[PDB]
Amino acid sequence: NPAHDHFETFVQAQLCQDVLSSFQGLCRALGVESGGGLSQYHKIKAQLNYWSAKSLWAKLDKRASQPVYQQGQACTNTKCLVVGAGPCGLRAAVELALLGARVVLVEKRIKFSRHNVLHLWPFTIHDLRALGAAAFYGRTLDHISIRQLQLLLLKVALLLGVEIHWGVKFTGLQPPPRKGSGWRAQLQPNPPAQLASYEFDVLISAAGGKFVPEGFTIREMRGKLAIGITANFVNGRTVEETQVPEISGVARIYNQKFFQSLLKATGIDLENIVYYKDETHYFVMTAKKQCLLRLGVLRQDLSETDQLLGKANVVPEALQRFARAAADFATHGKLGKLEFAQDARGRPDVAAFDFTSMMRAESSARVQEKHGARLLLGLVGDCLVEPFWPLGTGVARGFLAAFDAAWMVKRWAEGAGPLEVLAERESLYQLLSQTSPENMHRNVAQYGLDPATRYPNLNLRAVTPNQVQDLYD
Ligand SMILES: Cc1cc2nc3c(=O)[nH]c(=O)nc-3n(C[C@H](O)[C@H](O)[C@H](O)COP(=O)(O)OP(=O)(O)OC[C@H]3O[C@@H](n4cnc5c(N)ncnc54)[C@H](O)[C@@H]3O)c2cc1C
């Protein structure tokens, strides 16, 4: 059955292009238009009540029917543009969809190429499971690679009728030229008329570490130099490979004299290491600069980290030897001969990163108004709070920011004043950089958009309308 086959292909799909073609073939076969909101979702499921698909819709329905969404009517007025199909962009898109809003998302890339592996807090694991994650991804389960989290959330966003455009870069805004017009987006390359003319009152920016819209202030604090190295090796799925335990973190304190043993044998002095067994064997480690220079990884000692870890300063062969030697030792050689996975552009998949300079945006939202047309803008994900990767806070905190932005859009749609919406968002924002599974609500099954289910003794007035006046205009 060819609607069934397209749906089956869509579910099982493992390349961004393959998700898109099978989903389009599904829409064609069922006579529906993609990007058609919750109505699309209802029409698709009504045609696919066939048992195999049944538990998928039962989970998505159970989510959609949560009181907070008002059955897809809360934001039925609202038209959003989401920048970025990273995990946190798709996740915010899905919450916006379930609220009833029209949602268009633009992504500069045309594939999901990142293999690095991300740690998941308990709440996010339940969150994903609750979204049909088991039907979408066959494959311990406390971590997930970037691209598989993207494929999963892409298929959810698509079913829920989010309209997504690829190989399009958000470059800023076209303000209302006068009374009666809305906000539009500047886009590269020169967009088709459909996107050129799309007007929205909500912009959610989830463009990652290196982009926020004009008007946002970012805070950069630079601490003690830390240099991170990530590597992905091919994971054949040999029984032997499968039996090698993961290494949850190690470090000084923690699980220490391991680093004693590593240095002798190898000459590698590390601050931390982590091994995740996933689609690849992934390692992340923090290495002393002295040590990277001593072992030929960095070719000289530059004071500016962005130069220190630049292409010109990093030696590919030395970097590869270092990471393989470290990975082999941590695993006691039981992974066999390690082969580097071959990377977004065909290179061996190892790299060095600035683990030191940690941005935090000054606000999570702003409002811009012109000729009587208001635009609400919200940041979500790495562009709001940059994560320190070995501590595993990226997904968790990007997802919380996505719920908190969606809650704010709910409020916006309900008619609260811009200052009221902004002050309440910013009271939530004050908690973000200290959140932990320990200081949040413990029953993660009951987490939903309403922040009271997520943050205990919540204070939505921590920030006042006057404290946010400079965020409005
Ligand atoms: C090279 C790389 C490696 C990483 N490795 C790790 C790791 O090993 N461990 C870990 O914990 N975290 C890692 N991270 C961070 C981790 O991926 C993020 O915490 C997580 O994906 C959530 O990020 P996000 O959705 O906010 O942003 P991202 O994942 O950065 O996604 C941003 C999305 O926006 C798109 N985009 C950017 N600019 C525009 C524009 N102007 N218009 C349209 N689209 C745009 C990007 O193409 C991207 O698809 C890595 C990030 C990168 C970029």
Swiss-Prot record:
Provide the tissue specificity: Expressed in the postnatal and adult hippocampus; found in dentate gyrus, the polymorphic layer, cornu ammonis (CA) 1-3 and in mossy fibers of the striatum lucidum. In adult hippocampus strongly expressed in CA3 pyramidial neurons.
Stretches the record annotates as Monooxygenase domain:
1-473
Instruction: Give the UniProt subcellular location, in the record's own words.
Output: Cytoplasm; Cytoplasm, Cytoskeleton; Endosome membrane; Midbody
Q: What does the entry list as the binding residues for FAD?
A: C88, E107, K108, R109, R114, H115, N116, F170, Y282, D382
Give the sites modified to Phosphothreonine: T464
Q: Name the job this protein performs.
A: Monooxygenase that promotes depolymerization of F-actin by mediating oxidation of specific methionine residues on actin to form methionine-sulfoxide, resulting in actin filament disassembly and preventing repolymerization. In the absence of actin, it also functions as a NADPH oxidase producing H(2)O(2). Acts as a cytoskeletal regulator that connects NEDD9 to intermediate filaments. Also acts as a negative regulator of apoptosis via its interaction with STK38 and STK38L; acts by antagonizing STK38 and STK38L activation by MST1/STK4.
- Entry domain remark: The C-terminal coiled coil part contains the plexin-interacting region. The bivalent Mical/EHBP Rab binding (bMERB) domain, mediates binding to predominantly Rab8, Rab10, Rab13 and Rab15 (in their GTP-bound forms).
Q: Which family does it belong to?
A: Belongs to the Mical family.
Task: Describe the subunit structure.
Answer: Associates with the SH3 domain of NEDD9. Interacts with VIM and PLXNA3. Interacts with RAB1B, RAB8A, RAB10, RAB13 and RAB15 (in their GTP-bound forms); binding to RAB1B is of low affinity compared to other Rab proteins; at least in case of RAB8A and RAB10 can bind 2 molecules of the Rab proteins simultaneously. Interacts with STK38 and STK38L. Interacts with GRAF1/ARHGAP26, GRAF2/ARHGAP10, RAB8A, RAB8B and RAB10; may bind simultaneously to GRAFs and Rabs and connects GRAFs to Rabs. Does not interact with RAB1 and RAB11A.
List the protein's name: [F-actin]-monooxygenase MICAL1
Residue numbers of the full-length protein present here:
8 to 484 of 1048
